[PDB]
């Protein structure tokens, strides 16, 4: 089962903010690169480099 590995960052956000990131992912310019996938409602596989952006954008956004 050690078939495949992928370095990624695991984000453990709340059931409120997660969809916000998704929204960040789409309807965005130079984006949609951001989320690898939604593993759980709470957790997402995302970014790497994008994490700095996702966090900052969330901050700036309401």
């Amino acid at each position: 089962m050690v078939n495949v590995l992928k370095g990624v960052l695991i984000e453990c956000d709340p059931a409120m903010k997660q969809f916000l990131l998704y929204l960040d992912e789409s309807n965005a310019l130079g984006k949609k690169f951001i989320i690898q996938d939604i593993d759980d409602t709470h957790v997402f596989v995302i970014a790497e480099l994008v994490n700095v952006l996702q966090e900052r954008v969330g901050e700036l956004m309401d």
Partner: protein, 274 residues
Amino acid sequence: PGVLDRLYGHPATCLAVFRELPSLAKNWVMRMLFLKKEFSKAQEESTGLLSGLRIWHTQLLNLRIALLGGGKAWSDDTSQLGPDKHVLHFMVGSPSAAVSQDLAQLLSQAGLMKSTEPGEPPCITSAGFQFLLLDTPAQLWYFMLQYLQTAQSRGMDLVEILSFLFQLSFSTLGKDYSVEGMSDSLLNFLQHLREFGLVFQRTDQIRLWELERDRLRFTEGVLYNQFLSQVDFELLLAHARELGVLVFENSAKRLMVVTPAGHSDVKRFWKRQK
């Protein structure tokens, strides 16, 4: 009078018994201090002997004058003993003892100037690795050594003392780290150095804990694992992450799991052997 040797003897016995491993000696040594002491002490085991050595000079503070001179006489013996002996605990003991002899003003500046012990304090002072505890006794020794010289007219030691200058790099480090304790020790060295030789030398805050919390926000740096060949290899590789305590998440119906970066390598090794 006969009682005197007996009573104090019992505490000599107690210190002797739990002499080796820890730091039992300090309290008992003090009691022992009051009641050729140095010559006789020398035979006894080093640790504890040094402890007694340390506190006795401190304890001195007419007949007292006689005592100091007597101590001065065998300052060399302790000094010979100090070197040669030279853990952090031991190291603390050797400088603490040296420091104590220094305040007494019994030690000969010459002799001290050319001795390994002075090199050793700045050596530990230089190295980043030494702990805060070693640092404070090392620092104190230096301060006391300089304190001892109330002249510098005739004090070769106030040359080697200059070895403080070497410390600045160490202070730069220490500063880089948030080690306030170390820095304070440095300042004491500087201030003391200047002192000896000065003549010769020319609500509202509620938003501030919230602004601190704005600098912390979570995610983890991570490996994901997928496309696992059969369930036994998820469960082995998963249980071997869970005992390593670096599972961030798991879902057995996905055959998918997550490890933070610090145990990527123990997983990469277990994936290769079994």
